[PDB]
Amino acid sequence: MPVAYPEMARVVSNDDPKNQGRVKVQFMWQEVDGGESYWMRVQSPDAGKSEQVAKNRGFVFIPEPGDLVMVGFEQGNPDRPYVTGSLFYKANSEGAATDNTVKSMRTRSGHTLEFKDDEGGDWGITLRDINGNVIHLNSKDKNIDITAPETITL
Amino acid sequence: MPVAYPEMARVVSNDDPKNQGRVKVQFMWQEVDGGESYWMRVQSPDAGKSEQVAKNRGFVFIPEPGDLVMVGFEQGNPDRPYVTGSLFYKANSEGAATDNTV
Amino acid sequence: SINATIRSLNHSTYEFDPVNDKFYYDYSGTPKGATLGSRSAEKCSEPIFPT
Amino acid sequence: IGPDVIFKQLGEKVSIIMTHHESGEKTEFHGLISDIHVEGFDGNQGFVILEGGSPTILLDRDPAMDCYVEQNLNTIVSDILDKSGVKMNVTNNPKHTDIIPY
């Protein structure tokens, strides 16, 4: 019986026929010639259910095709793969800011939730999208700003 | 050829010269005398690019010096380390609230 | 005592570099040290491994 | 003769038949050659040792990486034996006929 250790792959597909949040990847020995795997599970920092939330309780961010991931094998068996995380590298990363002063969460449409730690300017929290709706908590000045291109309703 | 298994370390630097989000760590066998490693990758729950977001899409929270982390090795090779996650311990945490409500 | 055996020369290796974002590939090679026995052994073992 | 002319029998067929004269029973074997030694000591004319065995011996010299998605043992056996240059007679008849996902 063989023993396996973690590898790198690329996410290929997303449309799970059984509706369980599984993905398809392509390994590095399939790169020149093409090919893909079966459906495998993705692990999360939080997952479960409750009485008020029947399904999908926790952190649900399923990978997009083209992503570079790390694949692990449970019990050492190469027939039991699963995805452990995603990686930033040369093709998709701009790194950290000066003194590491920005922490963000973004989706593919452009939605953003951002924290800025620079106390010498640009210090606060922002929640916005690309169309122009902003909610900004300003810590240097102790202000709150709400901006909408068209209408604000209370 | 040797085979390596995960172990703990401490973060010493964030300032990557190639601007790719890499960090430098200090292993437990470098504690008494001193030393560092080279730059290593950190894995994320979400990381990619898009057509509207050219770079830095996903969950971007890069560790800070003094953090306790777990280090894994790719293909079992001790020359291929990467950071898998951070740890809470005695000098770090106040734990969970009553009934885990926060 | 001189011996010969059957071996396979149809092999390749690969590597992915994320710091430079490049995929490397290498296939087989060319002989540089051979005898008359080496040539007969490799000519006999050629049809066995076509993949 | 020349050792490199003897070395041209690599991979050839070998037959072994044993007969019991009193009863008439038989035993037959067919195989292939995989190693050859040419030896000589003290200035004699030498001798030869032929080594080999069943054709499955020549299926043990090629480590690789591959995978099969959603097939049964019947199809996997045929695919493996179709990518080798060794000629063999096969009786393909397993008992587990269901599909194996990976």
Interface A-C, measured as beta-carbon pairs within 8 A, has a size of 21
B35 token code pair: 């030393």
C24 residue type, one letter: Y
Among chain C residues, the shortest Cα distance to D8 is held by: C40
Decide: B21 and A95 in contact? Cβ < 8 Å: yes
Residue B44 CA to residue B85 CA, distance in Å, equals 8
Q: How close does chain A come to C43, measured CA to CA in Å?
A: 28
- Looking up tokens 């964030």 gives B14
Q: How many residues does chain A have?
A: 154
What residues contact B40, with CB distance under 8 A and at least 6 apart?
Answer: B22, B23, B24, B25, B71, B81, B82, B83
Q: Which of A44, A45, A46, A36 has the alpha carbon at shortest distance from A15?
A: A36
D41 residue type, one letter: F
Q: Sign of torsion, CA A124 A129 A132 A134?
A: negative
The pair phi, psi for residue D41, each rounded to 5°, is: -140, 150
- Looking up tokens 């019947």 gives D74
Residue D77 CA to residue D80 CA, distance in Å, equals 5
Is A90 within 8 Å of C20 when comparing Cβ atoms? yes
Q: Which is it for strands D47-53 and D26-39: parallel, antiparallel or unpaired?
A: antiparallel
C-alpha distances out from residue B90 to A32, A144, B62, C28, Å: 49, 37, 22, 55
C-alpha distances out from residue B77 to B73, D37, D65, Å: 6, 40, 18
Q: How close does chain D come to A87, measured CA to CA in Å?
A: 24
Which chain C residues have a beta carbon less than 8 Å from that of A8?
Answer: 16, 18
Is A28 within 8 Å of C21 when comparing Cβ atoms? no
The pair phi, psi for residue D82, each rounded to 5°, is: -85, -15
| Three-class HEC string of D11-53 | CCEEEEEEECCCCCCEEEEEEEEEEEEEECCCCCCCEEEEEEE
Chains D and B touch (3+ CB pairs under 8 A): no
Decide: A86 and A94 in contact? Cβ < 8 Å: no
Q: Could you tell me which chains touch chain B, where touching means 3 or more CB pairs under 8 A?
A: A, C
A16 residue type, one letter: D
D88 token code pair: 């063999």
Q: How close does chain D come to A78, measured CA to CA in Å?
A: 10
Please give the full DSSP string across C26-48, using - where no structure is assigned.
Answer: EE-----S--HHHHHHHHHHGGG
Compare CB distances from A86 to B44, B55, B64 and report the shortest one's residue: B44
- Looking up tokens 């009553």 gives B98
Q: What is the CA radius of gyration of chain C?
A: 16
Which chain C residues have a beta carbon less than 8 Å from that of A95?
Answer: none
Q: C19 touching B, CB under 8 A?
A: yes
Interface A-D, measured as beta-carbon pairs within 8 A, has a size of 13
Q: What DSSP character marks residue D100?
A: B
Residue A103 CA to residue B29 CA, distance in Å, equals 32
Q: Which of B3, B1, B32, B13 has the alpha carbon at shortest distance from B83?
A: B13
Decide: A60 and A48 in contact? Cβ < 8 Å: no
C-alpha distances out from residue D22 to B36, B38, C24, D28, Å: 82, 79, 68, 18
Which chain A residues have a beta carbon less than 8 Å from that of C18?
Answer: 8, 68, 87, 89-90
Stated resolution in angstroms: 2.8
- Looking up tokens 């259910």 gives A49
Among chain C residues, the shortest Cα distance to B18 is held by: C19
Among chain D residues, the shortest Cα distance to C6 is held by: D34
Q: C14 touching A, CB under 8 A?
A: yes
Among chain B residues, the shortest Cα distance to C18 is held by: B41
C-alpha distances out from residue B48 to A62, A109, A111, B58, D7, Å: 11, 13, 14, 6, 58
Q: Which is it for strands A112-117 and C2-5: parallel, antiparallel or unpaired?
A: unpaired
Decide: A146 and A135 in contact? Cβ < 8 Å: yes
Question: How many whole angstroms from its chain centre is CA C36?
Answer: 18
A24 token code pair: 């398809």
What residues contact D30, with CB distance under 8 A and at least 6 apart?
Answer: D13, D14, D15
D86 token code pair: 């060794």
Is C40 within 8 Å of D10 when comparing Cβ atoms? yes
Please give the full DSSP string across chain A, using - where no structure is assigned.
Answer: ------EEEEEEE---TTSS--BEEEEGGGTTT------B-B--SSEE--SS--S-EE---PPPTT-EEEEEEGGG-TTSEEEEEEE--TTT-----TTS-EEEEE-SS--EEEEEE-TTS-EEEEEE-TTS-EEEEETTTTEEEEE-SS----
